[PDB]
């Protein structure tokens, strides 16, 4: 407790930004600067210093994004968890010159969800999200509007952004794709909600809708209460649950999000906490122990927000006979793990194990080759792809662009009942995962869509490949 100064920063709240008259939202890329426990950091932001506004969309309507990348370098918009054709889809062949303009129109057309954005620049997409550049998409219908659920913005539904850094002793954050951060990733002591350390958010008695975000390069996360009391989950990555599932934890992959309500009852101010996680390099010390994530001060006023019985239905599981299967293996050169593993030791000493790298991750032996899409899927149609992580020790959450899926098996087990709804991440972690996938829109060899590790230097460091979906394939054609 004495680590961290007695009085909490309050929870900074991202703005929530609809369309305007002309039905467009305008986007700035840009450098700014933040402060962290007193010590002023340069960081980048979407419309401001450090993160990004919640870009508010409905069902149905058609918004054009105008884009404008401020910054000195290169950079690219992706919209996670966003089914969208792939011209839309801003991955690395999306790119944004320095004091360019793009414009993007998003016709949504899938479930009320919380969706991410973030830049995916080819081989620097660690570094740009590490320097602040996140933001949130949140995607309302009637469906979700009708279930009264907590809905005042900031006040009791509340965006909550989780994100680790590393900072040098003068302050900076200290981004480094070197061979340690490629085997195990980039992570840090400090842990970030939304852009402040250990912040205090005032709630009102009732019930309180967090909308979480794992938004770090390569931590995974495990969210609980401080008093235990139990975290209600109502939304994974891609919308509703069919009913909320009760948790008394929620271990959270690399971007990641869930919807959870929370009891809001007497007086007591309680913590949202995040747990130990056997994950390389991530109990390490101040990790080592339940951490803080965001201090819950109750106020006096009530919230009348609902916990309903039913949220939703999601479609039952078809036939998998006949249905195309994709086999990904996901592999690292074992050079890499070795010496990734050596510098680890070296940097952390014995406590490490307690409990050119640059192409050296791979999927089907092959490094991201952003020229060369490695199959085609077809429109419409119902996938099976099984991503396997036998051969190495390591964590990757598997993200898959273009859809938002349902996970079959999740590294040889079927998945829990809260991950077993939309989805557009799995695990896998020295085992094997199933997804039934299905996209929805096209995406041609110019503007293909990823599939990839979300662990951003494995990402950037070859673990992703690229892929079209059309109507259909024939080599006659
Ligand atoms: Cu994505
Ligand atoms: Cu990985």
Redesign the pocket.
């Known amino acids: 407790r004495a680590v961290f100064a007695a009085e909490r920063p309050t929870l900074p709240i991202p703005d929530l930004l609809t369309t305007d008259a002309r039905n467009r939202i305008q986007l700035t890329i840009g450098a700014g600067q933040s402060t962290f426990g007193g010590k002023t950091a340069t960081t980048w932001g979407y419309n401001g210093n450090l993160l990004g506004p919640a870009v508010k969309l409905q069902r149905g309507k058609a918004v054009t994004v105008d884009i404008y990348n401020q910054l000195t370098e290169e950079t690219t918009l992706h919209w996670h968890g966003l089914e969208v054709p792939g011209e839309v889809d801003g991955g690395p062949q999306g790119i944004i010159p320095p004091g360019g303009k793009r414009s993007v129109t998003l016709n949504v057309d899938q479930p009320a969800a919380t969706c991410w954005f973030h830049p995916h620049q080819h081989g620097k997409t660690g570094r740009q999200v590490a320097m602040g550049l996140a933001g949130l998409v949140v995607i309302e219908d009637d469906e979700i509007l009708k279930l009264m659920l907590p809905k005042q913005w900031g006040i009791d539904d509340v965006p909550v952004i989780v994100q680790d850094k590393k900072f040098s002793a003068d302050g900076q954050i200290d981004y480094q794709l070197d061979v340690m951060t490629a085997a195990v990733g980039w992570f840090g002591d400090t842990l970030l909600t939304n852009g402040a350390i250990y912040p205090q958010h005032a709630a009102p008695r009732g019930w309180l809708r967090l909308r979480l975000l794992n938004g770090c390069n390569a931590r995974s996360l495990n969210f609980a209460t401080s008093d235990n009391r139990p975290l209600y989950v109502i939304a994974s990555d891609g919308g509703l649950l069919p009913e909320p599932v009760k948790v008394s934890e929620l271990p959270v992959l690399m971007g990641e999000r869930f919807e959870v309500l929370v009891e809001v009852n007497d007086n007591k101010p309680f913590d949202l906490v995040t747990l130990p996680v056997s994950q390389m390099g991530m109990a390490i010390a101040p990790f080592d122990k339940p951490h803080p994530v965001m201090r819950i001060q109750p106020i006096a006023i009530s919230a009348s927000g609902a916990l309903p019985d039913t949220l939703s239905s999601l479609p039952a599981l078809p036939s998998l006979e006949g249905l195309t299967v994709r086999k990904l293996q ?1 592999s ?1 050169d074992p050079m890499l793990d070795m010496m990734g593993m050596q510098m680890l030791m070296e940097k952390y000493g014995d406590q490490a194990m307690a409990g050119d790298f640059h192409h050296a ?1 791979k999927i089907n032996g092959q490094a991201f080759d952003m020229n060369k899409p490695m199959f085609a899927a077809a429109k419409g149609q119902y996938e099976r792809w099984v991503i396997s ?1 036998v051969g190495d020790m ?5 993200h898959i662009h273009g859809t938002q899926f349902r996970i079959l098996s999740e590294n040889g087990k079927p998945p829990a009942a809260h991950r077993a709804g939309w989805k557009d991440t799995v695990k ?1 972690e020295g085992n094997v995962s199933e997804v039934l996938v299905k996209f929805n829109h096209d995406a041609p060899k110019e503007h293909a869509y990823m599939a990839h ?3 951003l230097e ?2 950037d460091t070859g ?1 992703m490949l690229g892929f079209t979906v059309s109507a259909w394939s024939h080599p006659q054609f």
């Open positions: 996901l690292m991750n992580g390591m964590l990757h959450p598997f896998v590790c979300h662990l494995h990402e673990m």
